[PDB]
Amino acid sequence: EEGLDFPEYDGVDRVINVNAKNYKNVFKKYEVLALLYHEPPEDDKASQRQFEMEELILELAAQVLEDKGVGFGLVDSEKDAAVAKKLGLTEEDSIYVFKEDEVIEYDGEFSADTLVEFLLDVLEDPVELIEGERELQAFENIEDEIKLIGYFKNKDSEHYKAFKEAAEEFHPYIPFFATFDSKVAKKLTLKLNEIDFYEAFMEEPVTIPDKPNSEEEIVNFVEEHRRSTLRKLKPESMYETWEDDMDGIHIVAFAEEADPDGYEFLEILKSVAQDNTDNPDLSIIWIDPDDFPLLVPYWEKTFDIDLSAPQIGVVNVTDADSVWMEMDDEEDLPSAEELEDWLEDVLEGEINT
């Protein structure tokens, strides 16, 4: 009796060298396939070590997800240029995820935790059905992401099928929910074939106009409303969010949700968002420092702030130059009006509008 060990990385290689000769068979073997499209090995040790680490991160994810039929592979942009073309791999050192007839160009954190969570989400069906109270309550409780909900006759409705096709386009980043139950639709205030879009952190939805909606109408609407006034930086999508800057800058708020002050600040931020939701020139990024433990020292040093307290600032995406609002913690946090006033002062002395 020694006592069984927790699972451990076993050092067995599972990541596939995907090439011209095997790529068709690889796609046949796995229902979900994650492929790292990468540049060939440079001569310097630094580059080789960076690649070595990325590959092992994939190995860890591959071990974890082996039983679930998720495969992992490498496509060398030189040795495997032809495979890349056929598959549409363009972005250097980027992960592409394949499920059925969909390709996803992953733009999140390169970590085993984040990748595994993402791929488990990918494996799920694209539409969540609401039948019970638990499920409806779960839907109502979602705030930190855009969500859509539609009421349809049944799974065979042409309009449900269009909704599902649209859901697949954004899977798994934007949750699509459906109900076939008139009582549920009643509580959600949905007419038949009506689809309500809830912007992140917004209480009131916007109904997609011109129902019943084609797949294209839904996709167009979501794309047009893709950027919420307040959005959360999430590991699974951090790079896409950060690269979607507001003319060279982001307004960035740090708030630890689990902390009393961080929670209060978040409620204030939500008020600011709600009061300015119609302004297309405004996006605030909420970062919870608890979600990014490896970046906290860097942020505290770079921005010269204490992340144990709520913060709000404006960051220049070009050089990481920034300015942060002074808040005395011996008094109440600034009100929504005060935050808006400060943002106006900072941004009025700028290059636009």
DSSP 281: T
For Na ion, give the closer residue by CB, 143 or 290: 290
Q: Which is nearer to Na ion, 16 or 218 (CB)?
A: 218
**Toward Ca ion, which CB reaches closer, 71 or 327?**
71
Distance of alpha carbon 305 from alpha carbon 311, whole angstroms: 8
Stretch that binds Ca ion, among 36-44, 118-126, 238-246, 332-340 (CB under 5 A): 118-126
Give the residue with the Cβ less far from Ca ion, 59 or 80: 80
Minimum distance from residue 27 beta carbon to Na ion (Å): 24
118 binds Ca ion (CB under 5 A): yes
Q: Which residues, numbered 290-309, are part of the site for Na ion (CB under 5 A)?
A: 290
Provide the residue count of the chain. Answer: 353
Q: Quick one: which H or E segment has residue 202?
A: none
Tokens of 242: 């950060």
Strand order in the sheet with 127-129: 127-129, 176-179, 147-151, 195-198, 206-207
- Cβ 5 to Ca ion, closest distance in Å? 26
Please, which of residues 18-47 interact with Na ion by CB under 5 A?
A: none
Q: Which does 168 bind (CB under 5 to 8 A by kind): Na ion, Ca ion, none?
A: none
Q: Which does 236 bind (CB under 5 to 8 A by kind): Ca ion, Na ion, none?
A: Ca ion
Contact between 16 and Ca ion by CB under 5 A: the answer reads: no
CB of 268: closest distance to Ca ion in angstroms? 17
Q: At what angle do helices 215-224 and 158-170 cross, to 10 degrees?
A: 40
Stretch that binds Ca ion, among 20-28, 137-145, 223-231, 303-311 (CB under 5 A): 223-231
Among 27, 239, 292, 324, binds Ca ion (CB under 5 A): 292
Q: Which of residues 86-145 bind Na ion (CB under 5 A)?
A: 121
Q: What binding mask, one character per residue, do residues 244-263 give for Na ion by CB under 5 A, x or -?
A: ------------xxx-----
Q: Which amino acid is at 108?
A: G
Alpha-carbon span 184 to 144, nearest angstrom: 22
- Is residue 295 within 8 A of residue 242, CB to CB? The reply is no
Breaks in the chain (C–N > 2.5 Å) following residue: none
* 168 touches Ca ion by CB under 5 A: no
Sequence-distant contacts of 39-47: CB under 8 A, at least 24 apart: 39/76, 39/77, 39/78, 39/92, 39/93, 40/76, 40/77, 40/78, 40/79
Residue number with CB closer to Ca ion (118 or 327): 118
H-type helices in the chain, by residue range?
23-29, 45-65, 81-87, 112-123, 133-141, 158-170, 182-187, 215-224, 238-243, 260-275, 296-303, 336-348
Least gap, CB of 346 to Na ion (angstroms)? 26
153's tokens? 């006759």
Contact call for residue 110 and Ca ion (CB under 5 A) = no
Q: Tell me whether residue 25 or residue 323 sits nearer to Ca ion (CB atom).
A: 25
Binding site for Na ion (CB under 5 A): 121, 172, 256-258, 288, 290
Binding site for Ca ion (CB under 5 A): 17-19, 74, 76, 80, 117-118, 121, 189, 210, 229, 235-236, 277, 292
